[PDB]
DNA sequence: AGGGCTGATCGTGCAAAAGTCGTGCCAGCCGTCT
DNA sequence: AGACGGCTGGCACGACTTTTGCAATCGCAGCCCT
């Protein structure tokens, strides 16, 4: 499936995220240090059978039902910095534009 | 094959070369020739085939020496299995603590 | 929702058939329409198939006077195999246009007693007639009829049945004369020279004379159609490079020097 | 000219089916036919480094195995501690049951008491997700490792002791009866169960390269652009024509006719791939009369397909399209799709038209985006929604529609606000 | 991995895990054994290379 | 250019040249009064000269003879209705020329039905097929000629009123033989080089006053068959004459 | 001297049984309110 | 605290699809059997 940037990270803390937006991007001006999230992308699994294992932790937990991982950008180590501006270009034929 | 990593470029395709392309053009050879001989064929092809097989074999081995393959838009020689031997870029090389 | 361009006059008789129209709309029985040649009653059905029937619903315009060979008119009604030279293929879709609609002719007086008779043992009923043997089906169709002469003239002369001529007219629809039209007319003349000079792609008001407009009044202009309003803007296109035209020509024959 | 069974003409054709035609058809096998046409060309005669860095992280599994191999272990634990790490699936739960443990080990000295603890030793390994049971008791450790300031942790821990099953049906009233719960509490305590990292190993495994094949294009510059189905991957293999001149010229009877039966096989291959090529622009064009309309109207708009209609509209033969839509995909600007997924499966709407099965299926999902969050739509609710979209579909084609878009029901959905 | 080919199983040994390429016999408490619909001996990783 | 055939030095000639120039200009309906052997597509020749699709020819081929259900046939065409099969649309009117305009002959002997299949072609109207529906549209002009006097059969109940109404949007008077007079020795002299031409003599070797005469004096039914008989009798005669040997004529009998 | 008869070359389909989907519908069950 | 309701899912029956399993007879004429 195709892959969308929408900040739904699981496995990750709310801190982390506390300076994403909801597109996924991160807003104009800010600063950076080490390793921290900039851009939010998952990558889809493949569906599974009825599995009662992970189906009880949907049933529990839901929104995310192993179907994604945590393939987000983040920032090199060693490397310190603030952001200046940001740019995203999209083909003809998709119209997500959540924060385009 | 683990000496012969397929390192994806694009991820698309693997894209194995220079380790691989001349197994894979000596192992269709080499099949063509072997169901060659039991259809009877006549002197002329197979002669021509097996030595197009002695040839890639050749070229497998040594390929600056006898013949010149290039890859896809490059036309760069190919690191046959004694061009990782010698040279500034063999396996000699490097082990000399580098 | 959408509405289909129309000529505008001042002829309360077509809005009250309008009306009637609209009234007929939810009501799905058959619909009969008195307009004689040249009325433009096959406009009146597919406005009325736009509101009449379900929305988006299928239309079909067959006039049986088209029809060429009888045994194509048997052909008209579903044949399953061994029929015609080639039975290989046979899908006569005139059921199928009638499935999931209404049903529009014109001018059904032509049509052999048989097929009147076949149409009123179908449509009373609801049955399909099939050419090959099949059973039948009761497609959901309406129908809606427009012809010139009067029903009651064909009773005397016999070619409706009773049963057929009042199963057939439900619903009476008179279709206002051209001639019966004056003011109405002349706006609808208005409009449609307003048409033709968009369409003709002439920046250049088409404009009129007086004697032009009396002599339009002295026609008789029996069909109401557009036709003779697109013939009497071809007078008009004979002449150019004129704000207003002079004079018309009632046809290429007449006035040939 | 309606005369029946009458004098009949002579046939001047015939079907000629050949299983050379059928292979030619190949039912559009694509790369699987561009294998076989190379193993063709093969049995045909006289027919036609990098970087390298070879480094990750092996899913923090090498990373675990390290850190216990790290932490002091004695020789026997530390097998057994391996053991355990080889008992890990991508998710972090053990695979294996101890006793399935405790018999591969083979060992009378060893026991269920030892083999346990060194799991609760293992258990406690360097990264989260290593608990190796239910999420429930990764929760726990994860609560463990959480700060005790955190409220309603206590509750949450009752819950899921011995309550795990009342959290699962979303049972609030007999779960807040048998545990006192407050109102909201259960609200704070989903709350604090959202950030319990499920799956923690999934993040781990932060690598996923991706997999896709160009095959056909449907880039439909400026409307209706004959983006070809991939024309640089389609094989066009030709014979040789030095060696067929070789064959022309060859001095043996016997070696001319087996050359002229080559060149044969060779035309017949030819004529194979003309025809391929032909059909694919042919079901472009098909697909270009319509798929316009599709992409601008939507996949809750999409008209319902049929493979003998459109077979018709090709005038090709309709079981000729049927094996040339198997195996087929197509690649649009709005994603990848198969031929059958191109195709659209029939279903019948009001106001004299025809609604695909997606397109009720996309346009269920669209209503389900708008429903209140504390209380899931029900089916009943779907299907009312249904007859204001005027669909003619009732509840049992809305359920169908959510069965392909997995709607969870209704009161699993439910959950509170 | 392919059938009798470049990369393939029952040839250069097992693949990144204990698991079997068909399915079965994937676990650690298997350790020379080689299954029938699939032979491929259940060993490390390593000795690939 | 279209190689300016049967170039017509009447002023009459000339006006309905121009008209027919206007006419292509348009793509709407439009009627050629025309006789037996006068205008044989020489007008649709000029219309195709100064058609809109001047790049792409129309159909023409508006002359056509056959059977009722041999009309009826050309209009609607069907592979598995018939006789013949595998053949749908085989006359392919529409299907002859995309756009243009549509040509039409000898509309007296269709018949009501097929006056009616004219009329709805003159509108914007569907395709006629023997089975199925025929949503195909495919738009295009519409041409017509006949020798008769629509408008008394007509009023004898021999044709469509509708049909012959609106099909008459502007009806193009054609002259016959008998019309052209004085450009009658033009056309002569025109087809004499045609043939030389054509029948390789090495020119017109010339005309006779007995000959004009004769000419003159004949009835001429046709407006250039007439005059192609005339110069076929000419080149076949004097091509070994080498002279204008007075006048010869065409007879399908002879006697002594 | 007369009969047998042998293999070259002979090109876009389909249909019929099977399968499978659309749609409707009944039977039980749990959440609930009486 | 037993019944209202809606779900869900199995169960069924027509309507559309679709896949595989299907190729002689030549017109040459020389060779072999009789
Ligand atoms: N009220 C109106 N406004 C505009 N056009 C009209 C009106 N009534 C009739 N017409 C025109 O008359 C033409 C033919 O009308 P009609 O006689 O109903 O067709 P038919 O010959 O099929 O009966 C149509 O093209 C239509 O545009
Ligand atoms: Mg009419």
Same mark, same amino acid.
């Given at each position: 499936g195709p892959e969308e940037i929408?900040?739904?990270?699981?496995?990750?803390?709310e801190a982390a995220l506390s300076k994403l937006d909801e597109s996924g991007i991160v807003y104009i001006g800010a600063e950076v240090t080490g390793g921290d999230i900039l851009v939010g992308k998952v990558t889809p699994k493949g569906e599974t059978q009825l599995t009662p294992e992970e189906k009880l932790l949907r049933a529990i937990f839901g929104e995310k039902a192993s179907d994604v991982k945590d393939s987000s950008l983040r920032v090199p180590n060693g490397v310190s910095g603030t952001v200046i501006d940001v740019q995203v270009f999209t083909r003809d034929g998709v119209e997500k534009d959540k924060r385009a | 094959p683990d000496l012969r990593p397929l390192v994806p470029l694009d991820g698309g395709r693997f894209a194995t070369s220079d380790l691989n392309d001349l197994y894979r053009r000596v192992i269709n050879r080499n099949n063509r020739l072997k169901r060659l001989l039991d259809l009877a064929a006549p002197d002329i092809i197979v002669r021509n085939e097996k030595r197009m097989l002695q040839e890639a074999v050749d070229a497998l081995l040594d390929n600056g020496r006898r013949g010149r393959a290039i890859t896809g838009s490059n036309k760069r020689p190919l690191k046959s299995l004694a061009d990782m031997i010698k040279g500034k870029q063999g396996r000699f090389r490097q082990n000399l603590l580098g | 929702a959408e509405y289909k361009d129309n000529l505008l006059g001042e002829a309360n008789s077509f809005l009250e058939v309008l009306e009637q129209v609209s009234h007929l709309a939810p009501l799905d029985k058959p619909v009969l329409i008195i307009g004689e040649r040249g009325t433009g009653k096959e406009l009146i059905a597919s406005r009325l198939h736009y509101? +009449? +029937?379900?929305?988006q619903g299928p239309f079909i315009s067959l006039n049986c006077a088209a029809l060429n060979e009888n045994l194509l008119d048997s052909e008209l009604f579903g044949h399953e195999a061994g029929a015609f030279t080639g039975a290989q293929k046979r899908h006569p879709g005139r059921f199928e246009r009638a499935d999931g609609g209404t049903l529009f002719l014109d001018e059904l007086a032509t049509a052999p007693m048989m097929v009147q008779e076949k149409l009123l043992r179908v449509i009373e009923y609801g049955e399909l007639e099939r050419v090959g043997g099949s059973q039948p089906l009761q497609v959901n169709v309406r129908l809606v009829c427009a012809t010139n002469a009067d029903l009651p003239a064909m009773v005397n002369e016999g070619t409706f049945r009773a049963d057929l001529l009042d199963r057939l007219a439900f619903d009476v629809v008179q279709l206002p004369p051209l001639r019966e039209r004056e003011s109405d007319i002349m706006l609808m003349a208005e409009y449609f020279a307003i048409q033709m000079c968009r369409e003709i792609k002439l920046p250049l008001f088409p404009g009129f004379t007086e004697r032009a407009r009396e002599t339009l009044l002295n026609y008789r202009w029996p069909g109401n159609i557009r036709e003779l309003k697109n013939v009497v803007e071809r007078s008009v296109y004979r002449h150019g490079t004129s704000d207003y035209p002079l004079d018309d020509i009632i046809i290429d024959p007449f006035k040939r020097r | 000219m309606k005369q029946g069974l009458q004098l009949r003409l002579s046939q001047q054709l015939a079907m000629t089916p050949q299983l050379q035609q059928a292979i030619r058809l190949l039912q559009l096998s694509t790369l699987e036919l561009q294998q076989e046409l190379q193993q063709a060309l093969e049995s045909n005669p006289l027919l036609e480094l990098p970087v390298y860095q070879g480094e990750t992280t092996q899913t923090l599994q090498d990373y675990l195995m390290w850190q216990v191999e790290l932490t002091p272990f004695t020789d026997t634990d530390r097998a057994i501690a391996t053991s355990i790490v080889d008992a890990v699936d991508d998710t972090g739960y053990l695979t294996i049951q101890i006793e399935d443990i405790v018999d591969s080990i083979? &060992? &009378?000295?060893?026991?269920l008491e030892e083999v346990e603890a060194v799991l609760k030793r293992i258990q406690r390994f360097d990264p989260v997700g290593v608990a190796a049971k239910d999420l429930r008791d990764c929760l726990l450790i994860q609560l463990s490792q959480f700060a005790k300031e955190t409220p309603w942790l206590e509750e949450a821990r009752l819950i899921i002791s011995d309550h795990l099953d009342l959290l699962a049906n979303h049972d609030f009233r007999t779960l807040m009866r048998v545990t006192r719960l407050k109102e909201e509490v259960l609200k704070e305590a989903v709350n604090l169960i959202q950030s319990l990292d499920p799956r923690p190993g999934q993040s781990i495994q932060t690598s996923e390269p991706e997999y896709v094949i160009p095959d056909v294009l449907v880039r439909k510059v400026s409307g209706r652009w004959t983006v070809e189905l991939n024309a640089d991957s389609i094989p066009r293999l030709k014979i040789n024509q030095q060696y067929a001149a070789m064959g022309n010229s060859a001095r043996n009877d016997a070696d001319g006719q087996f050359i002229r039966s080559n060149l044969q096989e060779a035309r017949w291959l030819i004529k194979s791939l003309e025809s391929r090529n032909d059909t694919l622009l042919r079901v472009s064009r098909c697909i270009v009369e319509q798929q316009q309309a599709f992409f601008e109207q939507g996949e809750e708009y999409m008209k319902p397909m049929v493979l003998a209609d459109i077979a018709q509209a090709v005038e090709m033969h309709e079981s000729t399209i049927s094996r040339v839509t198997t195996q087929k995909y197509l690649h649009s600007p709005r994603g990848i799709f198969e031929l059958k997924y191109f195709f659209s499966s029939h279903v019948n709407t009001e106001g004299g038209g025809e609604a695909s099965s997606t397109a009720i299926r996309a346009l269920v999902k669209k209503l389900i985006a708008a429903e209140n969050p504390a209380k899931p739509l029900s089916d009943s609710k779907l299907t009312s929604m249904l007859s204001e979209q005027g669909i003619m579909v009732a509840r049992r084609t809305v359920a169908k529609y959510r069965e392909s878009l997995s709607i969870p029901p209704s009161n699993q959905r439910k959950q509170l606000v | 991995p392919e059938r009798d080919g470049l990369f393939c199983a029952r040839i250069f040994g097992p693949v990144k895990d204990y698991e079997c390429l068909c399915g079965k016999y994937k676990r650690l408490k298997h350790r020379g054994v080689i299954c029938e619909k699939c032979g491929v001996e259940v060993t490390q990783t390593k000795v690939r290379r």
């Amino acid at each position: 499936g195709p892959e969308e940037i929408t900040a739904d990270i699981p496995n990750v803390g709310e801190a982390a995220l506390s300076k994403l937006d909801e597109s996924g991007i991160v807003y104009i001006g800010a600063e950076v240090t080490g390793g921290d999230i900039l851009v939010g992308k998952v990558t889809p699994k493949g569906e599974t059978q009825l599995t009662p294992e992970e189906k009880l932790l949907r049933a529990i937990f839901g929104e995310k039902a192993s179907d994604v991982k945590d393939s987000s950008l983040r920032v090199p180590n060693g490397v310190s910095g603030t952001v200046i501006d940001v740019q995203v270009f999209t083909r003809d034929g998709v119209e997500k534009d959540k924060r385009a | 094959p683990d000496l012969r990593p397929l390192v994806p470029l694009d991820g698309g395709r693997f894209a194995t070369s220079d380790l691989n392309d001349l197994y894979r053009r000596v192992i269709n050879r080499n099949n063509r020739l072997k169901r060659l001989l039991d259809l009877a064929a006549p002197d002329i092809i197979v002669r021509n085939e097996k030595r197009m097989l002695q040839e890639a074999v050749d070229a497998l081995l040594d390929n600056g020496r006898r013949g010149r393959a290039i890859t896809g838009s490059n036309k760069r020689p190919l690191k046959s299995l004694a061009d990782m031997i010698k040279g500034k870029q063999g396996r000699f090389r490097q082990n000399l603590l580098g | 929702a959408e509405y289909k361009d129309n000529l505008l006059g001042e002829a309360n008789s077509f809005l009250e058939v309008l009306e009637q129209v609209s009234h007929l709309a939810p009501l799905d029985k058959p619909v009969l329409i008195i307009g004689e040649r040249g009325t433009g009653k096959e406009l009146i059905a597919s406005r009325l198939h736009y509101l +009449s +029937s379900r929305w988006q619903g299928p239309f079909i315009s067959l006039n049986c006077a088209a029809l060429n060979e009888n045994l194509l008119d048997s052909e008209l009604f579903g044949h399953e195999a061994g029929a015609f030279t080639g039975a290989q293929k046979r899908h006569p879709g005139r059921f199928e246009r009638a499935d999931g609609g209404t049903l529009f002719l014109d001018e059904l007086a032509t049509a052999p007693m048989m097929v009147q008779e076949k149409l009123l043992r179908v449509i009373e009923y609801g049955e399909l007639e099939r050419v090959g043997g099949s059973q039948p089906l009761q497609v959901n169709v309406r129908l809606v009829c427009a012809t010139n002469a009067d029903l009651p003239a064909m009773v005397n002369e016999g070619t409706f049945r009773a049963d057929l001529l009042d199963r057939l007219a439900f619903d009476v629809v008179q279709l206002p004369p051209l001639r019966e039209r004056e003011s109405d007319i002349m706006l609808m003349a208005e409009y449609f020279a307003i048409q033709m000079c968009r369409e003709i792609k002439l920046p250049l008001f088409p404009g009129f004379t007086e004697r032009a407009r009396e002599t339009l009044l002295n026609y008789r202009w029996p069909g109401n159609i557009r036709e003779l309003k697109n013939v009497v803007e071809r007078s008009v296109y004979r002449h150019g490079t004129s704000d207003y035209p002079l004079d018309d020509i009632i046809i290429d024959p007449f006035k040939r020097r | 000219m309606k005369q029946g069974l009458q004098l009949r003409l002579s046939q001047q054709l015939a079907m000629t089916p050949q299983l050379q035609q059928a292979i030619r058809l190949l039912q559009l096998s694509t790369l699987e036919l561009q294998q076989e046409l190379q193993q063709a060309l093969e049995s045909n005669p006289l027919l036609e480094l990098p970087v390298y860095q070879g480094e990750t992280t092996q899913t923090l599994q090498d990373y675990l195995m390290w850190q216990v191999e790290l932490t002091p272990f004695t020789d026997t634990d530390r097998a057994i501690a391996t053991s355990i790490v080889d008992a890990v699936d991508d998710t972090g739960y053990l695979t294996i049951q101890i006793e399935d443990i405790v018999d591969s080990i083979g &060992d &009378d000295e060893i026991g269920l008491e030892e083999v346990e603890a060194v799991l609760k030793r293992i258990q406690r390994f360097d990264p989260v997700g290593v608990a190796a049971k239910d999420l429930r008791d990764c929760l726990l450790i994860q609560l463990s490792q959480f700060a005790k300031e955190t409220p309603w942790l206590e509750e949450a821990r009752l819950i899921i002791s011995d309550h795990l099953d009342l959290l699962a049906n979303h049972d609030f009233r007999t779960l807040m009866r048998v545990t006192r719960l407050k109102e909201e509490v259960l609200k704070e305590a989903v709350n604090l169960i959202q950030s319990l990292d499920p799956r923690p190993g999934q993040s781990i495994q932060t690598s996923e390269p991706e997999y896709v094949i160009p095959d056909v294009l449907v880039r439909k510059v400026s409307g209706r652009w004959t983006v070809e189905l991939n024309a640089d991957s389609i094989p066009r293999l030709k014979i040789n024509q030095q060696y067929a001149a070789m064959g022309n010229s060859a001095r043996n009877d016997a070696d001319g006719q087996f050359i002229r039966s080559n060149l044969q096989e060779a035309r017949w291959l030819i004529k194979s791939l003309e025809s391929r090529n032909d059909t694919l622009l042919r079901v472009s064009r098909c697909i270009v009369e319509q798929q316009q309309a599709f992409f601008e109207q939507g996949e809750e708009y999409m008209k319902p397909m049929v493979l003998a209609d459109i077979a018709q509209a090709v005038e090709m033969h309709e079981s000729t399209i049927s094996r040339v839509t198997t195996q087929k995909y197509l690649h649009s600007p709005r994603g990848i799709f198969e031929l059958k997924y191109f195709f659209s499966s029939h279903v019948n709407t009001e106001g004299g038209g025809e609604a695909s099965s997606t397109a009720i299926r996309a346009l269920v999902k669209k209503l389900i985006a708008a429903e209140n969050p504390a209380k899931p739509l029900s089916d009943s609710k779907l299907t009312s929604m249904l007859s204001e979209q005027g669909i003619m579909v009732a509840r049992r084609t809305v359920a169908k529609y959510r069965e392909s878009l997995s709607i969870p029901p209704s009161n699993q959905r439910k959950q509170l606000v | 991995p392919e059938r009798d080919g470049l990369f393939c199983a029952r040839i250069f040994g097992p693949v990144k895990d204990y698991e079997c390429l068909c399915g079965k016999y994937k676990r650690l408490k298997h350790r020379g054994v080689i299954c029938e619909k699939c032979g491929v001996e259940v060993t490390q990783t390593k000795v690939r290379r």
